[PDB]
Amino acid sequence: SITKDQIIEAVAAMSVMDVVELISAMEEKFGVSAAAAVAVAAGPVEAAEEKTEFDVILKAAGANKVAVIKAVRGATGLGLKEAKDLVESAPAALKEGVSKDDAEALKKALEEAGAEVEVK
Amino acid sequence: SITKDQIIEAVAAMSVMDVVELISAMEEKFGVSAAAAVAVAAGPVEAAEEKTEFDVILKAAGANKVAVIKAVRGATGLGLKEAKDLVESAPAALKEGVSKDDAEALKKALEEAGAEVEVK
Secondary structure, X not given: OOXXXXXXXHHOOOOHHHHHHHHHHHHHHHHOOOOOOOOOOOOOOOOOOOOOOEEEEEEEOOOOHHHHHHXXXXXXXXXXXXXXXXXXXXXXXXXXXXXXXXXXXXXXXXXXXXXXXXXX | OOOHHHHHHHHOOOOHHHHHHHHHHHHHHOOHHXXXXXXXXXXXXXXXXXXXXXXXXXXXXXXOHHHHHHHHHHHOOOXXXXXXXXXXXXXXXXXXXXXXXXXHHHHHHHHXXXXXXXXX
């Protein structure tokens, strides 16, 4: 009496774990687990983190909203308006999680114009 | 003697179709939500037994990215963009675990257009 149905009630006769073994058995039996598949080798969290995530915030455009607006749209590319509003909505984040070099690049640009920047 | 092993040889005793029916049954019983994992996990296991799991990969669209993109979205139905990226992200799997006939069908289509396909 090995009917399809009988098997259904059979799976509901054992525990989930016991079932996991079942399904697993076939995998090995029919050896349907060794062809190509994908890698996806996610390693376990390990110390030694990087530090390349700097955020450049704009506090005050200063007496050079013009140059600022340029630096803004220049660093991003938002519409003149968007950029305007952004600055007008100070403080406003310029960039988030950008390379230090880039952060300092714009920063120095702001300074050259005479604006207040924030590095965090 | 209602062992698990015995259930293993049971699947290896019946035809893939009979196994499909089974899984399909449980799918409803235990629910398609709870069995979903088993269904997708067993989906390939069953097909493998029929030796009807061929993978069609796209290596190079060739000098006919147009026709290719068509074949792609045509074989799948992904957004124009998605398809574009896919092709541009070669190699890219077009189909996975499909009938040989189907695999060769698209393959020949690619050739007709003049593209490089991969069958594995």
